[PDB]
Amino acid sequence: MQTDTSNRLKQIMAERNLKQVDILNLSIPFQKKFGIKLSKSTLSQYVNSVQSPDQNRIYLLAKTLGVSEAWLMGFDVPMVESK
């Protein structure tokens, strides 16, 4: 069994009372440190199950939110310990 990245993002937003604006703004310092861009439009496509994140944007969002990258991809693993 597994889930998808859209469900994982929705779990984050329910656990921590976040909206997409919070996710995107929390990511800004990480986008600069890692050299990985994420736009408002792209993040909405991930939450609405229109596209899956590529390798670089999983890494960005897993570091931003402090969660396992395998978990954020939708595998049935622990939320925190990969990377």
* Residue 44, CA distances (Å) to 8, 24, 40 in order: 14, 10, 6
User: What is the experimental resolution, given in Å to one decimal place?
Assistant: 1.3
Q: How many domains does the chain have?
A: 1
For CA atoms 75, 56, 10, 79, give the dihedral sign.
positive
Contact 73, 61 (CB under 8 A): no
For CA atoms 56, 33, 72, 77, give the dihedral sign.
positive
Residues, the chain = 83
Q: Residue 74 belongs to what domain range?
A: 1-80
